[PDB]
Amino acid sequence: SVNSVTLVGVVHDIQSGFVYEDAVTQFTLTTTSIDTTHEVVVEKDHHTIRCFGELFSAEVKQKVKEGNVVCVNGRLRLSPQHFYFPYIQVQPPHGQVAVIHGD
Amino acid sequence: KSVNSVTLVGVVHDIQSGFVYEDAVTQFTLTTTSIQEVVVEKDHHTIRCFGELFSAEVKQKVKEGNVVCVNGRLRLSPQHFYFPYIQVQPPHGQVAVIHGD
Amino acid sequence: VQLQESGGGLVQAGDSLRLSCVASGRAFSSYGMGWFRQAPGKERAFVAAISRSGGLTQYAESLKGRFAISRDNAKNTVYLQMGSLKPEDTAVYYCAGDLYGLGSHMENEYDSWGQGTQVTVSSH
Amino acid sequence: QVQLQESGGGLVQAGDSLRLSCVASGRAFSSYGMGWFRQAPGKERAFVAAISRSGGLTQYAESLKGRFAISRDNAKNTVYLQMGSLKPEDTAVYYCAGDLYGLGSHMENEYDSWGQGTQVTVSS
């Protein structure tokens, strides 16, 4: 009964803050699927990525920059806070955020 | 390989058939469950299966209470409010029924 | 609608092994396909199935995650990927067809059948 | 400054897989961000991978995500580099480095400690 999410996309809107007295750096991640046919359709999604931990949240806030491309592993979580807000819960050793440095 | 990819395992409720923008789909609720700690969090994901063939195959085989593995894209569709769901459609997505006993 | 398994034989426990079922006729693309198995003395049990559209698969609970089913209508072929073998996976593997294009865990719901292949895992 | 020691190098065949280790001397490792770089003939030492202290922030050279993966075990003061589907182009000397600030980076500039390096030869 697992819950896994893997996203590769572009970072916007990095913000550090708190929630329930827990450090959190959150950002939006934009993904773009280019439809595979043999026309030319392109779906684009924005996801809320949320990094828990005093260390990890800080690491993230420091290193990760607007416009970076990254790869994220975490849990798709639904927040009732009927309305359910979907964010990705990322915190080691379960999840991680990888920066992809190009050129 | 996949820019947007989700893998969920859990239990099927609320199987329903219908139409989005004329496109044929069957939809169901999938309920994952992650576990002085003991964090026991439920998450009731909306699954949408697209495709003329695919939608019917699901409705004919998948039944209330089944366990399934689901693979697909996370997406957000509003109308003032945003709806979170999971898009399953071959050859990218998959609903995999798991048989017990 | 004809069916022929290919790629059995024997192999060392811990090994992966890919199987193949080839269908004759041009109806394959409409057939639900399934893989069943049978060890010496015991009943023939379900393993995996894949629907026509290929988006709805099915798995024996225990034998899941190790085994993967897929199809290539182009080659009129259904495959079975067996990750990590074990002495208990020694048996005769059959491929089956479903006219109604679903696949099932219930064999009696399959109209077509293969000759069956012979997987034989080492050790024991 | 901390003393780092690569290992696991050697002669390898294309398509192969190799895992490298780096062991940190003494204390303070758990506070260190770690990184791998490599130097190929005719070229300057290049960034490969890095991992924060925590370590949920990893960093990767674009041409090498998918094939390489960095990890650490602080209960062994070790950082690893798992390499997959090796190519001739991966032939190089591979060094580990240590970042005091706990982060790691793509910049050679930003590590106080360096290993001696270990050679990986990928016979084409």
Method: X-ray
Give the total number of structural domains in chain C: 1
Residue B78, both tokens: 């509003």
**CATH, domain range B1-101:** 2.40.50.140
Contacts of B43 in chain A (CB under 8 A): 3, 76-78
- Distance separating alpha carbons of residues B86 and A47, to the nearest angstrom: 13
Contact C54 B91 (CB under 8 A): yes
**CATH, domain range A1-103:** 2.40.50.140
- Distance separating alpha carbons of residues D60 and D68, to the nearest angstrom: 9
Residue D88, both tokens: 């001739």
Domain ranges of chain A: 1-103
Residue among C54, C56, C104 whose CB faces B58 most closely: C56
Q: Is C54 helix (H, G, I), strand (E, B) or coil?
A: coil
Please, is B38 exposed, middle or buried when counting C-beta atoms within 10 Å of its C-beta (0-12, 13-18, 19+)?
A: exposed
Interface test with B, best of C43, C56, C102 (most B CBs within 10 A): C56
Contact A45 B9 (CB under 8 A): no
Contacts of A103 in chain D (CB under 8 A): 62
Query: Is residue A93 reached through a cis peptide bond, with omega within 30 degrees of 0 on the bond before it?
Result: yes
DSSP codes of every residue in B11-65? EEEEEEEEEETTEEEEEEEEEEEE------EEEEEEEEEESHHHHHHHHHH--TT
Contacts of C31 in chain B (CB under 8 A): none
Q: Is A63 helix (H, G, I), strand (E, B) or coil?
A: helix
Contact B4 A33 (CB under 8 A): yes
Q: Is C30 helix (H, G, I), strand (E, B) or coil?
A: helix
- Distance separating alpha carbons of residues D84 and D20, to the nearest angstrom: 12
CB A48 within 8 A of CB A39: no
Which of the 8 DSSP states describes residue B80? -
Q: Is B100 helix (H, G, I), strand (E, B) or coil?
A: coil
Interface test with D, best of A61, A63, A70, A103 (most D CBs within 10 A): A63
Contacts of A83 in chain B (CB under 8 A): 81
User: Is chain A adjacent to chain C, meaning 3+ CB pairs within 8 angstroms?
Assistant: no
Residue among B10, B44, B45 whose CB faces A1 most closely: B10
Resolution stated for this PDB structure, in Å: 2.4
CATH number at residue C103: 2.60.40.10
* Length of chain A (residues): 103
Partnered with residue C85 across adjacent β-strands are none
**Within chain B, what is the greatest distance between any pair of CA atoms?**
51
* Length of chain C (residues): 124
Q: CB neighbours (10 Å) of residue B101?
A: 5
Can you give the residue range of the structural domain that contains C86?
1-124
C-alpha distances out from residue C108 to A57, C46, C117, D101, Å: 56, 11, 19, 65
